[PDB]
Amino acid sequence: GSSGSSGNPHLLVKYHSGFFVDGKFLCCQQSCKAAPGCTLWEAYSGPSSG
Ligand SMILES: [Zn+2]
Structure with a gap:
């Protein structure tokens, strides 16, 4: 096991x-009340990926 x-x-x-x-x-x-989390790991400003 x-x-x-x-x-x-x-x-x-x-x-x-x-x-x-x-x-x-x-x-x-x-x-809805039981909606999926809104605060996601994202941001407008940041080191764009190339
Ligand atoms: Zn929210």
Whole structure:
């Protein structure tokens, strides 16, 4: 058997850098409540890849 020396099955998890008001988010303001994380690892400015 292989018990494994891992910590958790979830490694790629996101969160909401906002709040939940009027049944709508303030960070992304998605349509549903259980929507997929909005705060993704991205940025406008950065060393473009060549
Ligand atoms: Zn959000």
